[PDB]
Paper text:
Copper-containing nitrite reductases (CuNIRs) catalyze transformation of nitrite to nitric oxide, which has impacts on geochemical, agricultural, and medical health fields. CuNIRs typically have an ∼110 kDa homotrimeric structure, like a Reuleaux triangle. Each protomer contains one type 1 copper (T1Cu) and one type 2 copper (T2Cu) site. The Cys residue forms a peptide-bond bridge (Cys-His bridge) together with one of the His ligands at the T2Cu site to transfer the electron to the catalytic T2Cu site, which is coordinated by three His residues and an axial water molecule.
We therefore used the C135A mutant, in which the Cys residue of the Cys-His bridge is replaced with Ala. The Ala residue does not coordinate to the T1Cu atom, thereby greatly suppressing ET from T1Cu to T2Cu. Moreover, we performed the experiment at cryogenic temperature (100 K) to trap the NO2--bound state, which spontaneously decomposes during room temperature (RT) neutron data collection over a week. NX joint refinement was performed using reflections up to 1.70 Å resolution for ND and 1.30 Å resolution for XRD data. The ligand was modeled as a mixture of a major NO2- ligand (occupancy 0.7) and a minor water ligand (occupancy 0.3). The neutron-scattering length density map shows that the nitrite ligand is in the deprotonated form (NO2-) rather than in the protonated HNO2 form; thus, it does not form an H-bond with AspCAT. The shortest distance between NO2- and AspCAT is 3.2 Å, indicating that there is only a van der Waals contact. The NO2- ligand shows a κ1-O coordination manner with Cu-Onitrite distances of 1.8 and 2.7 Å. The 2mFo-DFc neutron-scattering length density map shows D atoms on the two N atoms in the imidazole ring of HisCAT, showing that HisCAT is protonated in the substrate-bound state at pD5.9. In contrast, AspCAT is in the deprotonated state.
Numbering used by the authors:
A (entry chain A), B (entry chain A), C (entry chain A): 16 to 315
Amino acid sequence: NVIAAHKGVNQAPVPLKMERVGPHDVHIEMTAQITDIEIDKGKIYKAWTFNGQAPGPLVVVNEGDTIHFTLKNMDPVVPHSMDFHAVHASPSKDFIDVMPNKSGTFTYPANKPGVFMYHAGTKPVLQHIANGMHGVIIVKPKNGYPTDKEVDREYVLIQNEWYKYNDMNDFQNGVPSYVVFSSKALKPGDPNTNGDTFTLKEKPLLAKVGEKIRLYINNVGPNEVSSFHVVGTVFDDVYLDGNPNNHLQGMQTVMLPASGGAVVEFTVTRPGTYPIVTHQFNHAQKGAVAMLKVTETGED
Amino acid sequence: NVIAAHKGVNQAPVPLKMERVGPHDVHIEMTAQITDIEIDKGKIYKAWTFNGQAPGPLVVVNEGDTIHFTLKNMDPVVPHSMDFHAVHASPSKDFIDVMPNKSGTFTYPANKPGVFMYHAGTKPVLQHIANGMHGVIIVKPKNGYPTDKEVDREYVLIQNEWYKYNDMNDFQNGVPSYVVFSSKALKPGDPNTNGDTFTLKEKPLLAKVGEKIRLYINNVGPNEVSSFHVVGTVFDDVYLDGNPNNHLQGMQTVMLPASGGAVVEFTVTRPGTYPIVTHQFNHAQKGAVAMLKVTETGED
Amino acid sequence: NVIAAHKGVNQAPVPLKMERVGPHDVHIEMTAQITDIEIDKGKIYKAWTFNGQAPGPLVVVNEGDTIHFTLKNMDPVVPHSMDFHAVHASPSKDFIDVMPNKSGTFTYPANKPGVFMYHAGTKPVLQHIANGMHGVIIVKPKNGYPTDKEVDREYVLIQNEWYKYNDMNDFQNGVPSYVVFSSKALKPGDPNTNGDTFTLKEKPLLAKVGEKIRLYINNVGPNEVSSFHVVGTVFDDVYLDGNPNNHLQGMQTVMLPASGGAVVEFTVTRPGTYPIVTHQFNHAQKGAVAMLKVTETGED
Ligand SMILES: O=N[O-]
Ligand SMILES: O=N[O-]
Ligand SMILES: O=N[O-]
Ligand SMILES: [Cu+2]
Ligand SMILES: [Cu+2]
Ligand SMILES: [Cu+2]
Ligand SMILES: [Cu+2]
Ligand SMILES: [Cu+2]
Ligand SMILES: [Cu+2]
Ligand SMILES: [Cu+2]
Ligand SMILES: [Cu+2]
Ligand SMILES: [Cu+2]
C-alpha cells in the first residue's frame, strides 16, 4: 500500500516556523511531508505528516489571534490541506488542498480558548488522519483559567491510533493496531515526541513531589474515544475542550470524543512513577500508557 | 434474512398525525410499517419503521404536555411498540407490544425539556432499533434557552447506523456497514430525509453568512457513540440532552452516548460549504457526513 | 488458557473485612483469589477476583478517610495488587504486587467524594481487569449532595464485560462476549450479586411507586464506554463521578468512560418493571439489562 512515488521517501523533519506579526496576528508555516516514524519497536510507518512529526508540531496562539497559515506541500503526488478546529473559516475556501510542490496561504481567526485538534481536510479525511496528519493547536484564554495560580508545571499530551499501513479497509473496519501518546513541547527543555508505544515509558515526563500538574490533552483519533486517567491521583479541576467555563472538579477519568480536548489538573503527593492511560484497556495494552516520574527535586 | 411475510412488502410512507387536544395534552398517531429505504446508492434496506421513515417522523411537544399516543401496527407478522425517552411511564404497561393489524393507545407525560430518542421497545430491542425503529421527540422548554434570541435558523439532525439486513449476529458483533445523518423538518420548507449516506451531501442544509445556527441532535445508535463536530466553526453554546441547565460553551466537538441528544449552536462567518461529521472518522467515511451550504442570501 | 496451577481451583468467597480505626482512618482487608463465577447460564468463568466476587465487594468510606489496605494473595502462582481510583498514592510504591501466599499493606487517603473504580494494577492490567479484578469504592461527600433529602431509596450498579477466558488476543482485539450489570449492597437486605447476564433480570431491584431512586454507578470496562439509561424515566439529577459539583439535570442517558462513575437520581411514577440498560444495544443484547420492579408497596 506504499504508492510508487513514496517508495524510499523519508523527508527529514523541519522545525515549525511561526512569528507574531501584530498584536492579534500571527504567521505560521508548515510543510506536508512523508516521513518514516518508528511507532513501535521495529515498526516503521511512512507517515503523512506536518513537518515530519506525527502528531504534528504544537501550535500555541492567544485568544483573538488571526492566523495567516501557509502550507508547503513536499509530497510528490498527494494533495494535502489544513483544518484547524480552533478557527472560524469557510471550509471550501480556507481548508482547501495544496497540490504537490505548491504552497497555499489561508487566513482565519482563533476566537475561542481551548485545546483544539488540527488535521488535513483532504478527502478521504480518514485516510489523511490515520496516516498521521493530525495535531493540536492551543488557544490561550485572554482571562486565563481560575486555577492558573495553583499550577506548578504543565505538559501537552496527545492520543492517536495507528492502523495497517495506508489500508482504507482497516482504517474504516478494523481495530487499531497501536494506540499511543505523544508529548509536544510548551517551553524549552520539554520533551517533543511522536505517537509511539514506548518513548514516554522509557523517558517519562518529570515532576516534583507535591506539585499540581496541568495537562493540555486531545484525543485526535481517528476513530476511538478516550477514557483519560492518571493513576494515583484524581483530577482536581477539568476544563472541557479547554474552555474555562466548562469546569468540572474531582474527576477520576475524563471522557474525550474523537478530536476532544481538555485541560486537566491534578496533584502528585508522593515520589514514584505514575502511569497515564486511556482506561479503555485494550488501547492501553496496545501502547497507550505514558509515565510521569515524580521525584523529590523534579529532576531525573 | 427477509422473513416470508415481508417478501415484496413495501408499505408507502404516511404523514404523522398529531393534534393538540388541550392546553397540556396532545394526540399522536404513528403506524409501524415495513418500507424499502435507499440507505446508500444502489442499496435498499427493507426497514422496520414508524410511518415509512427511518429515523421516524419528528415529534415536537411542549414541556408539561401529556401525550396520548396511538400505534397502529401494519406489519403482517412482527409486533412493535413505542418507548419515548421523553416520558415518565411504566415500561411494562405503557411501552407494550401492539400485535399485527391491531392498534394500542398509551398515555404519559413529557415533564422534561430536551432532545430525546424514541424507539420500539419490543424484544430484542437491538433488532428493532437496528432495523430502523428509532426517532427523535423534542420537548420545548417552558422557559426557553438563554440564547434563544441569538439564533437565526435551526434544524434537526439524527445519526444512526445500518448493519447487514436483519442479521442479529452482525447487529451485536459487527462494525456498522453505514453510519448516516438525516434531517427532520421543524417548519414548512425544511428538508425531511431518511438516514442515508448521500442526501445531505447532495442537498445540503442551507444558511446565510453570519447566522447563528441551532441544531437539535440525537445519536440514536443502535451501538455507537458520536463525536459530533461542524467543520469551520466552534459551538458557541451546547445544552446536553437539550436541558437548558446543562450548558457548555466553546466546544469543538460534542460527545453523544448512544441515545444521547443535545442542542448545539454555532456561527458561520463566511460563505462556503461546511461539513458536519461524527469525528470518529471510520463512521464519517461510511456515510456520516452532512453538508451545510452558507450563502450570502441563505437561499440556494 | 487455564494455567496448570489454576486447574480445579475454586476458592470459596469470603466476606470483606473492614473496620474503622479512627475518626478519619479505616482498615480494609481483601484476598486475591481464583473463583468460578457463572457469568451466563451454563457458562463458568474461573475469575481472578477480590474475595471471590467479580466485580469485587463494595467499599464505602467517608471523604477524608485514610485507608490502611491489606491484600492477601491466595492465588498459588499469579501476583496481584490493588489500585483504588479514590486515593492519592504513589503507584510504584503503594499499588505494587503481592506475591502468591503473601500479604501486603498500603496506606493512602481518599480526599475526594465520588464513585470510583478499583482494580488490580499488576501488568498486564488489561489481563487482570478482564479476568475479574475490578470493583467500586464509594467516598461519601462530607457535605452530602444537594438532593440528598429527596432520595427515597438507593442502590449500586456496576457494568463490566467478559471475554474469552484469559485470552489476551481477544481482550485487546475482540468484541466482548458478554456485557453485564451487578449490584453491590449498601445496607442489610440489599442484593449483592456478580457480573452476569441474568440475576438482575430474574431478581429485579425493588422500589415503590412514586419514589426517587439514587444509583451509584460505575462502568469498570475493561474496554467499552457505557450509555447508561433507565427506561420509563429521565434522570432528575446527575453528579459526574459522584462529585457534587459536577451537577447535570434532566439527562435521558449518561455517558460513562471506561472507569467512569456517576450518581444518578430518577423518579418512578407508575407500577411496573423498568429496564436499566447501556443504550449501546449490542452490549444490552449481550447481557447488559437489569430490571427495577416498582410496586405499590416496594416489596415483592
Ligand atoms: O488506573 N489505571 O489502570
Ligand atoms: O473536522 N472534520 O474533520
Ligand atoms: O430505553 N431502553 O431501550
Ligand atoms: Cu500576514
Ligand atoms: Cu494529508
Ligand atoms: Cu476535524
Ligand atoms: Cu386523548
Ligand atoms: Cu419494531
Ligand atoms: Cu431507549
Ligand atoms: Cu492502621
Ligand atoms: Cu489480578
Ligand atoms: Cu485504573
